[PDB]
DNA sequence: CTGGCCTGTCTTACACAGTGATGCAAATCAAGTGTGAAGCCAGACAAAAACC
DNA sequence: GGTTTTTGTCTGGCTTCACACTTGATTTGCATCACTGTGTAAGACAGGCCAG
DNA sequence: CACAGTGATACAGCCCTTAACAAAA
DNA sequence: GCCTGTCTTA
DNA sequence: TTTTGTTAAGGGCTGTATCACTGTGTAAGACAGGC
């Protein structure tokens, strides 16, 4: 399956949030990511998501 | 016993062998106690003939997941006649007890249905079809095709549903995509090649007799099924036509794709023509265009050849304007009368055609040479109504055998009574002749007597052995010679009408068929004069007169038979009882969609997976 | 495993006239009925289980429920003290069975209703069926292709099962569950019989009789006048002896005196039933009476003793129309449960009082409801 | 010689079984990983138990 | 009584999952729809025994 | 009638199981 | 030198 | 030095090919009304 826009975003923003706070838990890191991304700009994420979606659709 | 005791205990009772096994593993297998014990146990399981548990252990160690694709779930559901409720019970039970989702839920199967049904893939016609919509998302359509239903109009007493003919052709082609690609591969051609494919579509239509379900006072309910069968697909690769697909079982109910289902009488001409005319119109329109459709990523083009051979004589006569079967004009291929056909045995030719028949109706209607009804009827050779479907009437291998055997049986009875020598005979004398023949066949040939003509009596009676048997009851042996030669000519003719490809299987039989039928009729006319009454059957007439022309027209006989659709009714009723909403408008389209799915070659591939 | 005839068991004392073989499964329902051309013509095919063998299979089926119920009552799994099994016995004809002439079928079946175990001198229930009237727990005993009104064939086929049941009525069943031998004794209650089949198997007259009750000796007239003070009187033995009285005519009476003496028992009974009532029929009978009272209170029938058919018909039409207007009640040609359920309300009584002049009669109708 | 009036067929009402479709709520998936909970290991040995 | 077994005891350091948290777009679960045919049984009804 | 289509039943084909060589790798 | 449903079974 | 094939006689599960058996659809003749 292809990842949601938010999901590819999360994979790309893992290193930023990690470098600033190294010991943040998975609950904490994901809570942050979701909160700040939820407050947001995010259209290229949805674009990449749609592209990967139709790419996976083609895959039989 | 080991398995009675607890883990601490079993470890106690096995410690010695555990140490020996650890030694063996470290010295030979690099310390993999897990793998060595697994292999020991698997091979022990195989030793006690308990392969099932060993294979299940193998699959759980490999971790290979068991999940049926929704398309396979649909294949099973369709092919075992499970309703949604019954499938749901089985699904939820297997999922609850194995914890794993082996079968897929019902919505997944509905979605997988959408792919296999008309109206899913896109396509184009070049040039666009005349009077046919270009929309590609059409599925089930109302079979009345907008037929007026107000109280003023003619009363509409039938429910019908159909597909759009082009759309159904697209769905069928996409269904057989894998077979087309595999057929090109098996012919040493390329998967990606797109050169023009040609599709020979066999058209069919029959009534399904009674369909009623009843609790007596049985109100009958008849049905008509309009179908098509992809017979072969070829590709032009040179000045050569390579056969990339050929339907293996052309008379099976498996490949007889339902195109229109209607609850109406095949003898009800007004409704028959109102329901079928739109289909015929789409069929005509497609005769003048090329279909482009994407398969395996490559657009392909398809040219179609519709051949209406799935019509029994009654329906042929009805849709082609001819008279009812009791007419003097017995053949639907030529203008012969019963008398003419009985005196002239072999020399007739295929002269009727849809155009001629349209013409003759117009002659009948306008009476241009101001003739009496007998003279007019003679002029138009019995075409007294306007034809409305172009058909290609044929004969099945069965009726050739049947007609020949009926004639030989009558000849046997008369040769036992020496009618060649005695003209007259009472009813008692002929009855005793027949009793003699039936007793003697039961005695020496183990042949049960039958009160009604049938196929396998013909098959078992048309043998030289039976001729020796009956010759044991004939005085003169010149008549022995005559009978042996007549049966020899029969046996020289039979391979042509029975074989699947007579051009390849018995080329000498096909080449000499016409000469042999001439000699056959000449032997009947010289040494069997008594069996002439001015009567003959269409089956015998077609066998002696039209077999070579029909072969040259179609390549074969036995494959355009009338044999299979006797299962259809059963199929229909089943779907109506167990897989259909109980409402007149919906039940019909549920029967249609289930019948479509039942014919798809995709799912049949899943249902023959073991081979 | 799941069919009768698999597990072993014992009856102490051995059942009277019943084989002791325990490996018996499906057996011919004709039970050796003669079929020669000389004998009576046998037009039926039937198959059955031996009644005890079926009881065994049914208990073993519910073994898990019995043990878990014993646990749930804070009792020990291994206890074996006498279990008492209550068994609802049932019979009905199944109408037309034909696949297409009518082909009728009778089904004789049973239901395990309750299993109690004895600890000290309390009878603690270990199991009881949650859905007693479900098709799911109605264990089939004998299936036959015959008319339930074909008395000769019915008796011929069902008498061997009744013999076996009679035999089990005085014996104990020893049966191994979870390794421990347990002991069961049974109570048979033939309550699953609709009225026509009750009357047929208990020797009574057909439903149109004056003897309207299968619990008591009342006549239609008596029950109409007395109405409430009646008691359950009839029993299978009283009916066998009333048949013998009819048969022997000991006091040399005329046919009417004799019929009054035996209170309808003109035929010999051959099944002991427990005739009951359906909650549905209670509602329906009450609702029919209330419907008639409503239409007559609308027409005020006390003031019109000689009212004609058409006047009462217009009374009924008035009530139908107003009930459709106020309670949205479609008028009915025949009575059913949903009608009774919607009509037997206090608000319906208010709606019908809206058509009754005298309010003193409103009081009475409302108290009745 | 003709009723009323006590009886087995007839005639539809009527509940409802169960069809494939539908529609909305609620799991579910997918990623990251650091935990905590959990059965197991080894060896000298003694309880609570059945076998001669 | 001796001679055979089951089943415990004491640690930790191990390995292998489940849970933790978020978002939102799929996928499942489940009850429901509209709808007639069919069985069942509540009716009506002609019918024939028998008396004025 | 022929044949479809039921549950029961008979028959054939399945991969092995003993030792040893040994062919491919 | 009839036509054409209905019916009977095989 | 490490993987598989192989021989021969022969022993159980499993898969499918029938059994027997009747209902049933289709159609092949028989037959009778066109008062
Ligand atoms: Mn036909
Ligand atoms: Mn009943
Ligand atoms: Zn011809
Ligand atoms: Zn009472």
Swiss-Prot record, chain A:
Modified positions (Phosphoserine) in chain numbering: 4
PTM annotation (N6-acetyllysine): residues: 31-32, 42
Tissue expression from the record: Ubiquitous. Expressed in platelets.
Main location: nucleus
Gene Ontology CC: alphav-beta3 integrin-HMGB1 complex; cell surface; condensed chromosome; early endosome; endoplasmic reticulum; endoplasmic reticulum-Golgi intermediate compartment; extracellular region; extracellular space
Record note on modification: Phosphorylated at serine residues. Phosphorylation in both NLS regions is required for cytoplasmic translocation followed by secretion. Acetylated on multiple sites upon stimulation with LPS. Acetylation on lysine residues in the nuclear localization signals (NLS 1 and NLS 2) leads to cytoplasmic localization and subsequent secretion.
Region feature Cytokine-stimulating activity, mapped onto this chain: 1-12
Any one GO BP annotation for this protein: positive regulation of transcription by RNA polymerase II
Induction: (Microbial infection) Protein levels increase upon infection by human coronavirus SARS-CoV-2.
Residues annotated as transmembrane: none
Key word Endoplasmic reticulum present: yes
Residue(s) carrying Cysteine sulfonic acid (-SO3H): 10
Residue ranges flagged as DNA-binding region: 1-60
Keywords: Acetylation, Adaptive immunity, ADP-ribosylation, Autophagy, Cell membrane, Chemotaxis, Chromosome, Cytoplasm, Disulfide bond, DNA damage, DNA recombination, DNA repair, DNA-binding, Endoplasmic reticulum, Endosome, Host-virus interaction, Immunity, Inflammatory response, Innate immunity, Isopeptide bond, Membrane, Nucleus, Oxidation, Phosphoprotein, Repeat, Secreted
Effect of residue 10 to S: Inhibits oxidation-dependent inactivation of immunostimmulatory activity in apoptotic cells
Annotated localization: Nucleus; Chromosome; Cytoplasm; Secreted
A GO molecular-function annotation: calcium-dependent protein kinase regulator activity
Known partners and oligomeric status: Interacts (fully reduced HMGB1) with CXCL12; probably in a 1:2 ratio involving two molecules of CXCL12, each interacting with one HMG box of HMGB1; inhibited by glycyrrhizin. Associates with the TLR4:LY96 receptor complex. Component of the RAG complex composed of core components RAG1 and RAG2, and associated component HMGB1 or HMGB2. Interacts (in cytoplasm upon starvation) with BECN1; inhibits the interaction of BECN1 and BCL2 leading to promotion of autophagy. Interacts with KPNA1; involved in nuclear import. Interacts with SREBF1, TLR2, TLR4, TLR9, PTPRZ1, APEX1, FEN1, POLB, TERT.
Protein family (similarity comment): Belongs to the HMGB family.
Other facts: Proposed to contribute to the pathogenesis of various chronic inflammatory and autoimmune diseases, and cancer. High serum levels are found in several inflammatory events including sepsis, rheumatoid arthritis, artherosclerosis chronic kidney disease, systemic lupus erythematosus (SLE). Seems to be implicated in other diseases characterized by cell death and damage, including diabetes and Alzheimer's disease. Its nucleosome-associated release during secondary necrosis may play a role in SLE.
The protein, known as: High mobility group protein B1
Gene name of the record: HMGB1
Swiss-Prot record, chain B:
Gene: Rag1
Tissue expression notes: Maturing lymphoid cells and central nervous system.
Cofactor note: Binds 1 divalent metal cation per subunit. Mg(2+) or Mn(2+).
Listed result of changing residue 575 to A/W: Capable of nicking but defective for hairpinning
Site (Essential for DNA hairpin formation, participates in base-stacking interactions near the cleavage site): 497
An example molecular function term from Gene Ontology annotations: protein homodimerization activity
Function: Catalytic component of the RAG complex, a multiprotein complex that mediates the DNA cleavage phase during V(D)J recombination. V(D)J recombination assembles a diverse repertoire of immunoglobulin and T-cell receptor genes in developing B and T-lymphocytes through rearrangement of different V (variable), in some cases D (diversity), and J (joining) gene segments. In the RAG complex, RAG1 mediates the DNA-binding to the conserved recombination signal sequences (RSS) and catalyzes the DNA cleavage activities by introducing a double-strand break between the RSS and the adjacent coding segment.
Effect the entry attributes to changing residue 311 to A: Deficient in both nicking and hairpin formation
Organism name: Mus musculus
Cellular localisation: Nucleus
Parent-protein start and end of this portion: 395 to 1007 of 1040
Key words, A-Z: Chromatin regulator, DNA recombination, DNA-binding, Endonuclease, Hydrolase, Isopeptide bond, Metal-binding, Multifunctional enzyme, Nuclease, Nucleus, Transferase, Ubl conjugation, Ubl conjugation pathway, Zinc, Zinc-finger
UniProt-recorded name of the protein: V(D)J recombination-activating protein 1
